[PDB]
C-alpha cells in the first residue's frame, strides 16, 4: 500500500503503517538560497547531517477534554543539539521542515485533529491593549495549549480556541498546509514547510516563521478500554538549514 | 482579480492644517506615513500576508473660512506645498522653515481650483514585499517593539499653505488617498472580525463568531 | 494654444477613475520582486475553498464551537430530519460569515454552483444512510423526507470515505441573484433525513457529529462591488 | 433609431444639500436609483418593455448663497463628493460618517467651475434586460408589493460637500442626468396617455380618449 | 548619476513686492541670479568645481491680502510681469517705467490661478563652463574682488504687478526655482562642512571634523 | 475645441516632477562645451572612493 511510509534524514528514520499522503508547503519543497536571491555576502555553513535529522519533542496526552496546543517554530528546537547550537551562534539562519505528528488509538476509539502550519501567527493577547511577554506563546520544546472560555489572565495570550489566537475563524484554518488525523483511518501526519518569508533569511531567535497547532475537532472517545489518554508525539527535522553572521553565542 | 480588489483610490487620512493661528502647529499637517489609521484600506490589505505593488497617491484638498463676527476680506487663491521627507531627512519645525526648500526631497505645490495632485511612487521597502504583519520584536533580545510598527519606516509626509497667510483664519482639510497597482500578493487570511482598537497593534476585544438565531431549524424571518 | 473644450466630468473626483497622475518620487528605485508562495489574483480562488459552516447555529448555545456540530444520534425516528438551511449564502445566517459568504458581502449580484461536503465524524464502528436534498423555490418548504426526495438529491452512504458532496445547481429564472437576497430571487432550501438509521455496535458512544463545508464551483462568479455590511466605527482609531 | 430616440440626457432626479444647517439631513442627499419620478424619461423608456443598455451618467451641482441679513464672506471654492452605495452597503447618516471612506464603492469627487461630472456604467441588471413594468408580486404566495417597484434595487446615491462649512449658509442643488448607449428594446407598448400621479406604481386617474370637436364632418378651425 | 542627483527643482530665492505701497521699491523685486543665497541648492552644485549645464526656470507667485481695519474690497485676478536684463540693460526705477516695455529682453506675463510659469534656458556662460569657485581675483594686479564673485554676471530678474493696483495692499510673494538638465560637471570637491555665513564668499567659522563618544570603545547607544 | 476633462492632480507642483516648459530666453545660444577632466556621472563614483575613517574617534 500507499499507506506505508518510510523517511529519512541524517541518522534517523521514520515509518509508519497507517498514513495518509504527505503533504508539501505550496508544493513547495524546501531548497538552499541561490545566489541571486542572496544579500549577505558571508560563505554561510550548512552543518547538514548534525542539523538536518529528526527531533523528537516532549510527548503530550490527548484526553477527552483536551481543547488544542500550539509549538511556535524555531523556538521549539533551539535547545535541540547542533540545531540549537548552530541557532545561537549566528546572526541569521534558514531552514525547512519535515513535521511528522504521531497518534496511534485502535478501531475502537474515536476522535479527528487539525495539524496545521500557520505561517506568521501573530497572536493577541487575552486583555486587549496589554501587552505580554514572549513567555505567554514560547519556550522551547514546551507545548502551549488553548482553552475553551475566553483567557482573563492578562500576562497570557487570548487561548479561546475558536478564534485560534488570532482573532479568525478557526473552521477556515484549513487555507494553511494541514493534514487531518482521523482515528479511523490514520495514525500520523506529515507535513514538509519549505521556507516562507518576506526576507531571504532572518535571525532565529526573534521572529517565528511559523507555528504547528494540533486541535481536537471531534473529540477523543472510547468505550470500557483500559487505556485512558492518548499520547501525541511531535517529531521534526530542519531542511536545509544554513547560518550567516558568525559570532558570539547568544546567553538564552 | 487582486488588481482589481485592490485598484480603487482609498481615504487613507485626513488633517487640518490653518492659514493664521497662534499654535505654530495648527498651520501645518506632520503624517508619519501607514495604513493602519482608515479601517476600510486597512481590511482590504490585511487580507494577504505580504503585498507587493507600485502606489497611485492622489490629494483632496478644500478650504473653508472660519466663522466670526467679522468675516469680509478678499483673499486671492491659495496655493499648498506637499513635500515628502524620507526617513533620516531634516523635518519642518514651522511653516516657514528652511527645509521646505525641497532641493532633495520631493515636493507638490498645487493651486486651488485645479484637478487633484496626483502622482505615482515605485514599490518601496527595504524587504522583497511589505509586511502587513510581523509576528517579532525589534530587538534580538525578544524585547523592544513588538509587531507590525516595527517595520514600518517609510517617512513623513509634511503640508502648508505656501505665503497664505490672510486676515481672518481659513481653514483647509487635507485627505490623502492611496491606489495600488502593478499589484502582487501572497499568503491570504481570514479577514478582521473584531473592530480595531488601535493603529499601530492587532489589539482587539474577543467578539462572537456570528450573530445567533432561535433554534437550529429557524429558517423564517418573522 | 490647440483649440479645446471641457464637457461635463472636467475636474471631478470619481472613486473609481482610471486616470494617469505624476509621481511624486520621481525615478525612485524600487526594491526587487520576491517569489512569495501563494500569491492570489482573484477574490473567486478563496471563495472556491472549504470553509466550516456553523450550521447548528441554534438559539440556546453555550458553547461557541457546538455551531460546528450537527448532531446525529442511534435509535432515531425513521425518516427524521436532521437539519434544513435555506440557501442564501450571503444573507442567512448559517452562510453570511463563512470565506464565501464574506466575499459575497463585498458585492451586489451572484450566480453559479455550490459545494456542501458533509463529513461524518463519529467512530469506525458506526454506520448511517442519509438522504441530503436541495429544493428550488416554491411557495412551501419541504416539511417531510417524502417531500424532500422529490428535488435534487444524494444518497450518503457511510464508509472509509467520511466525506459526501452534495452539489447545489445553479436554478434560477435570472442569470444573477442579489447578495441581498429578497424573494423574487430566491433559491430555495437545503435539508437532510435519515436515510436509515446511525446503527452501532457494542461498545460505542450513543450520538455523534456531522460536519458542513461550502465552497463555490468553477462557474461561480460576482459582480457590483459594494461595502461590507460587517465592519465599521463611530470614531477614528486612536 | 431607438439608439438615438433614447440617446439624449435626460434630468432623472434633483435635490437640494445645505453647506450648514441645524439639521442633519438638509446636508446631505440620499437618493435610491430609479427612472420614474421625471415624467419625461419615464414616458420614453416606458415605450418599451424591456430594454437593454449602457448608461451614461452626467451631474450638474450648482450653488448660490442663501439670503440673510448679513452675506459678508469669502469662501474658498466649493468640492463635491458623490458616492455610488450598492444594495447592503453601509449608508452615511450624516456628513461627517466613516462611510464616506469609500475604500470600494465608486465616489467622484468634483470642484466648481469645471466641466461638469461625468461617467459609464455598464448594464448592470441581474436579468438579461432591464423591466420597465413587472406584473407581478414579490411573494410566491401573491402577496407582497406588486408592480416593477419589485424589481428595483439598483443602489443609492449619496452625495455631500467635502468639507464646505461655511459662516453664512450656501444651498448646493444637484441635477442627475442619464443617456442610455448601446441599446436595445423589446416587445414596444402604446405610449401613457393617463398622466403620472406616483413614482412606484401605474397608477392613474381615466383620461379621455382624445378631444371632441362638434361633428364628426367638422374640418374648419373657427 | 549627477543628472539626476541636479535635476530636481530647488528654491533658489524668494522675495514680497506690495501691490500698493508708498515706498516705490516694496513694489517690485529686483535680484542678481545668483545660486548662493540658498543653503540647500549651493551644497549640491558646489559638490563639483565646474558644472555645465541647460537650465529649467519655475515660479511660483503667490499673493495674500493684507491685514487692515477695512478689508472690504472685490479685486479682479493678479497678472504679473517677470523680465529678465541681460548685464548692461536699462534697469527699472519704479513699477511704471519705460524699461519694462521688453522689446527685446525676455518677458513672461502670468496670471494667477494657472499652472505656475516656466522656460528652458540655456547654457549661457562666456566660458567653457560655470564656475563654482574661483580662487583668483579681478585685477591683473591682484587685488580688487576675490573669489567666485567676480565671475557671476548673470544679469537680473526684475518682477512687477502689471496693473495691479488695489484699494487695499495685497503682498505677493514669488519663489524661484532652478533645475539644471543635460548636465556635466567636473573635478568633485569635498562637501561643505561649516555652516555657510555669507553669499558671496566662502566664508565660515571653524566646525569640528565631527561628533564625539567617549572612548574608541564605545559602541553602545545608553 | 477638442473635449477635455481635468482628472486630480491637475495644476499641482509637484517637487520631483519631470514636465516640459517653455523658454524664457528663445534661441540664447549657449557657450561651446569644453572637455574638463573629472566628469561624474553617478554619486555611487564617489562612494567608491576611499576616504580616511576616524576610527580613534575617543572622549579624551
Given at each position: 500500500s500507499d499507506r506505508v511510509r518510510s523517511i529519512t534524514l541524517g541518522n534517523s528514520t521514520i515509518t509508519t503503517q497507517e498514513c495518509a499522503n504527505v503533504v508539501v508547503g505550496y508544493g513547495r519543497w524546501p531548497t538552499y538560497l541561490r545566489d541571486d536571491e542572496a544579500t549577505?555576502?558571508?560563505?554561510?555553513?550548512?552543518?547538514?547531517?548534525?542539523?538536518?535529522?529528526?527531533?523528537?519533542?516532549?510527548?503530550?496526552?490527548?484526553?477527552?477534554?483536551?481543547?488544542?496546543?500550539?509549538?511556535?517554530?524555531?523556538?521549539?528546537?533551539?535547545?535541540?543539539?547542533?540545531?540549537?547550537?548552530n541557532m545561537q551562534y549566528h546572526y541569521l539562519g534558514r531552514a525547512g521542515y519535515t513535521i511528522h505528528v504521531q497518534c496511534n488509538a485502535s478501531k475502537f476509539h474515536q476522535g479527528c485533529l487539525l495539524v496545521v502550519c500557520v505561517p506568521e501567527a501573530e497572536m493577541g493577547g487575552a486583555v486587549v491593549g496589554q501587552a505580554f511577554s514572549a513567555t505567554a506563546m514560547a519556550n522551547g520544546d514546551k507545548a502551549y495549549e488553548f482553552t475553551s472560555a475566553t483567557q482573563s489572565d492578562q500576562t497570557k495570550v487570548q487561548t479561546a480556541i475558536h478564534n485560534a489566537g488570532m482573532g479568525v475563524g478557526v473552521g477556515n484554518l484549513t487555507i494553511y498546509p494541514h493534514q487531518w488525523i482521523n482515528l479511523r483511518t490514520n495514525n500520523s501526519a506529515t507535513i514538509v514547510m519549505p521556507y516562507i518569508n518576506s526576507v531571504p533569511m532572518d535571525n532565529m531567535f526573534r521572529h517565528y516563521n511559523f507555528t504547528l497547532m494540533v486541535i481536537p475537532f471531534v473529540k477523543l472517545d472510547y468505550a470500557d478500554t483500559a487505556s485512558t489518554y492518548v499520547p501525541i508525539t511531535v517529531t521534526v527535522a530542519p531542511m536545509c538549514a544554513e547560518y550567516n553572521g558568525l559570532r558570539l553565542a547568544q546567553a538564552q | 482579480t487582486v488588481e482589481n480588489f485592490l485598484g480603487r483610490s482609498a481615504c487613507v487620512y485626513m488633517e487640518e492644517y490653518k492659514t493664521t493661528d497662534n499654535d505654530v502647529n495648527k498651520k501645518f499637517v506632520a503624517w508619519p506615513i501607514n495604513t493602519k489609521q482608515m479601517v476600510q484600506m486597512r481590511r482590504k490589505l490585511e487580507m494577504f500576508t505580504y503585498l507587493r505593488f507600485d502606489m497611485e497617491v492622489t490629494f483632496v484638498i478644500?478650504?473653508?473660512?472660519?466663522?466670526?463676527?467679522?468675516?469680509?476680506?478678499?483673499?486671492?487663491?491659495?496655493?499648498?506645498?506637499?513635500?515628502?521627507?524620507?526617513?533620516?531627512?531634516?523635518?519642518?519645525?514651522?511653516?516657514?522653515?528652511?527645509?521646505?526648500?525641497?532641493?532633495?526631497?520631493?515636493?507638490?505645490?498645487?493651486?486651488?481650483?485645479?484637478?487633484?495632485?496626483?502622482?505615482?511612487?515605485?514599490?518601496?521597502?527595504?524587504?522583497?514585499?511589505?509586511?502587513?504583519?510581523?509576528?517579532?520584536?525589534?530587538?534580538?533580545?525578544?524585547?523592544?517593539?513588538?509587531?507590525?510598527?516595527?517595520?514600518?519606516?517609510?517617512?513623513?509626509?509634511?503640508?502648508?499653505?505656501?505665503?497664505?497667510?490672510?486676515?481672518?483664519?481659513?481653514?483647509?482639510?487635507?485627505?490623502?488617498?492611496?491606489?495600488?497597482?502593478?499589484?502582487?500578493?501572497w499568503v491570504p487570511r481570514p479577514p478582521r472580525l473584531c473592530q480595531y482598537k488601535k493603529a499601530f497593534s492587532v489589539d482587539f476585544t474577543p467578539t462572537p463568531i456570528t450573530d445567533t438565531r432561535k433554534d437550529i431549524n429557524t429558517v423564517t424571518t418573522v | 494654444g490647440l483649440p479645446t473644450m471641457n464637457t461635463p466630468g472636467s475636474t471631478q473626483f470619481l472613486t473609481s477613475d482610471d486616470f494617469q497622475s505624476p509621481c511624486a518620487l520621481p525615478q525612485f528605485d524600487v526594491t526587487p520582486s520576491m517569489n512569495i508562495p501563494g500569491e492570489v489574483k482573484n477574490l473567486m480562488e478563496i471563495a472556491e475553498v472549504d470553509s466550516v459552516?456553523?450550521?447548528?447555529?441554534?438559539?440556546?448555545?453555550?458553547?461557541?464551537?457546538?455551531?460546528?456540530?450537527?448532531?446525529?444520534?442511534?435509535?432515531?425516528?425513521?425518516?427524521?430530519?436532521?437539519?434544513?438551511?435555506?440557501?442564501?449564502?450571503?444573507?442567512?445566517?448559517?452562510?453570511?460569515?463563512?470565506?464565501?459568504?464574506?466575499?459575497?458581502?463585498?458585492?451586489?449580484?451572484?450566480?453559479?454552483?455550490?459545494?456542501?461536503?458533509?463529513?461524518?465524524?463519529?467512530?469506525?464502528?458506526?454506520?448511517?444512510?442519509?438522504?441530503?436534498?436541495?429544493?428550488?423555490?416554491?411557495?412551501?418548504?419541504?416539511?417531510?423526507?417524502?417531500?424532500?426526495?422529490?428535488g435534487t438529491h444524494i444518497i450518503w452512504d457511510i464508509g472509509l470515505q467520511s466525506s459526501c458532496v452534495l452539489?447545489?445547481?445553479?436554478?434560477?429564472?435570472?442569470?444573477?441573484?442579489?447578495?441581498?437576497?429578497?424573494?423574487?430571487?430566491?433559491?430555495?432550501?437545503?435539508?437532510?433525513?435519515?436515510?436509515?438509521?446511525?446503527?452501532?455496535?457494542?461498545?460505542?458512544?450513543?450520538?455523534?457529529?456531522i460536519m458542513c463545508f461550502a465552497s463555490a464551483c468553477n462557474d461561480f462568479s460576482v459582480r457590483m462591488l459594494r461595502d461590507t455590511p460587517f465592519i465599521s466605527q463611530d470614531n477614528k482609531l486612536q
Amino acid at each position: 500500500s500507499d499507506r506505508v511510509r518510510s523517511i529519512t534524514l541524517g541518522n534517523s528514520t521514520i515509518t509508519t503503517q497507517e498514513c495518509a499522503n504527505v503533504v508539501v508547503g505550496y508544493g513547495r519543497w524546501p531548497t538552499y538560497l541561490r545566489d541571486d536571491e542572496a544579500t549577505a555576502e558571508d560563505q554561510p555553513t550548512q552543518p547538514d547531517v548534525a542539523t538536518c535529522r529528526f527531533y523528537t519533542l516532549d510527548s503530550i496526552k490527548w484526553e477527552k477534554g483536551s481543547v488544542g496546543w500550539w509549538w511556535k517554530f524555531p523556538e521549539a528546537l533551539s535547545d535541540m543539539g547542533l540545531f540549537g547550537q548552530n541557532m545561537q551562534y549566528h546572526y541569521l539562519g534558514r531552514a525547512g521542515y519535515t513535521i511528522h505528528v504521531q497518534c496511534n488509538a485502535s478501531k475502537f476509539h474515536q476522535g479527528c485533529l487539525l495539524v496545521v502550519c500557520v505561517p506568521e501567527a501573530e497572536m493577541g493577547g487575552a486583555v486587549v491593549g496589554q501587552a505580554f511577554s514572549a513567555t505567554a506563546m514560547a519556550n522551547g520544546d514546551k507545548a502551549y495549549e488553548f482553552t475553551s472560555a475566553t483567557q482573563s489572565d492578562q500576562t497570557k495570550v487570548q487561548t479561546a480556541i475558536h478564534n485560534a489566537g488570532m482573532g479568525v475563524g478557526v473552521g477556515n484554518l484549513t487555507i494553511y498546509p494541514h493534514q487531518w488525523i482521523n482515528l479511523r483511518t490514520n495514525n500520523s501526519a506529515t507535513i514538509v514547510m519549505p521556507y516562507i518569508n518576506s526576507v531571504p533569511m532572518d535571525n532565529m531567535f526573534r521572529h517565528y516563521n511559523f507555528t504547528l497547532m494540533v486541535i481536537p475537532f471531534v473529540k477523543l472517545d472510547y468505550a470500557d478500554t483500559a487505556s485512558t489518554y492518548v499520547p501525541i508525539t511531535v517529531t521534526v527535522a530542519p531542511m536545509c538549514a544554513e547560518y550567516n553572521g558568525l559570532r558570539l553565542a547568544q546567553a538564552q | 482579480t487582486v488588481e482589481n480588489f485592490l485598484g480603487r483610490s482609498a481615504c487613507v487620512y485626513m488633517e487640518e492644517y490653518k492659514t493664521t493661528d497662534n499654535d505654530v502647529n495648527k498651520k501645518f499637517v506632520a503624517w508619519p506615513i501607514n495604513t493602519k489609521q482608515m479601517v476600510q484600506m486597512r481590511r482590504k490589505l490585511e487580507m494577504f500576508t505580504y503585498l507587493r505593488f507600485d502606489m497611485e497617491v492622489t490629494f483632496v484638498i478644500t478650504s473653508r473660512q472660519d466663522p466670526g463676527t467679522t468675516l469680509a476680506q478678499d483673499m486671492p487663491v491659495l496655493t499648498h506645498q506637499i513635500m515628502y521627507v524620507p526617513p533620516g531627512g531634516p523635518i519642518p519645525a514651522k511653516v516657514d522653515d528652511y527645509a521646505w526648500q525641497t532641493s532633495t526631497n520631493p515636493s507638490i505645490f498645487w493651486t486651488e481650483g485645479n484637478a487633484p495632485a496626483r502622482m505615482s511612487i515605485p514599490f518601496i521597502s527595504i524587504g522583497n514585499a511589505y509586511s502587513n504583519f510581523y509576528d517579532g520584536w525589534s530587538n534580538f533580545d525578544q524585547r523592544g517593539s513588538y509587531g507590525y510598527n516595527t517595520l514600518n519606516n517609510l517617512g513623513h509626509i509634511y503640508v502648508r499653505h505656501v505665503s497664505g497667510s490672510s486676515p481672518h483664519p481659513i481653514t483647509s482639510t487635507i485627505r490623502v488617498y492611496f491606489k495600488p497597482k502593478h499589484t502582487r500578493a501572497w499568503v491570504p487570511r481570514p479577514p478582521r472580525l473584531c473592530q480595531y482598537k488601535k493603529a499601530f497593534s492587532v489589539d482587539f476585544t474577543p467578539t462572537p463568531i456570528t450573530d445567533t438565531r432561535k433554534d437550529i431549524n429557524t429558517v423564517t424571518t418573522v | 494654444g490647440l483649440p479645446t473644450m471641457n464637457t461635463p466630468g472636467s475636474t471631478q473626483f470619481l472613486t473609481s477613475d482610471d486616470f494617469q497622475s505624476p509621481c511624486a518620487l520621481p525615478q525612485f528605485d524600487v526594491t526587487p520582486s520576491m517569489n512569495i508562495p501563494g500569491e492570489v489574483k482573484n477574490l473567486m480562488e478563496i471563495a472556491e475553498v472549504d470553509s466550516v459552516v456553523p450550521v447548528n447555529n441554534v438559539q440556546d448555545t453555550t458553547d461557541q464551537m457546538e455551531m460546528f456540530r450537527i448532531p446525529v444520534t442511534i435509535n432515531a425516528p425513521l425518516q427524521q430530519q436532521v437539519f434544513g438551511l435555506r440557501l442564501q449564502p450571503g444573507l442567512d445566517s448559517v452562510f453570511k460569515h463563512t470565506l464565501l459568504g464574506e466575499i459575497l458581502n463585498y458585492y451586489a449580484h451572484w450566480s453559479g454552483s455550490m459545494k456542501l461536503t458533509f463529513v461524518f465524524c463519529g467512530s469506525a464502528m458506526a454506520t448511517g444512510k442519509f438522504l441530503i436534498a436541495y429544493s428550488p423555490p416554491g411557495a412551501n418548504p419541504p416539511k417531510t423526507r417524502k417531500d424532500a426526495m422529490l428535488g435534487t438529491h444524494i444518497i450518503w452512504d457511510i464508509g472509509l470515505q467520511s466525506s459526501c458532496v452534495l452539489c447545489v445547481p445553479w436554478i434560477s429564472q435570472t442569470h444573477y441573484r442579489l447578495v441581498q437576497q429578497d424573494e423574487y430571487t430566491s433559491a430555495g432550501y437545503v435539508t437532510c433525513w435519515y436515510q436509515t438509521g446511525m446503527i452501532v455496535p457494542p461498545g460505542t458512544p450513543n450520538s455523534s457529529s456531522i460536519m458542513c463545508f461550502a465552497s463555490a464551483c468553477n462557474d461561480f462568479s460576482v459582480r457590483m462591488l459594494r461595502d461590507t455590511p460587517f465592519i465599521s466605527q463611530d470614531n477614528k482609531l486612536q
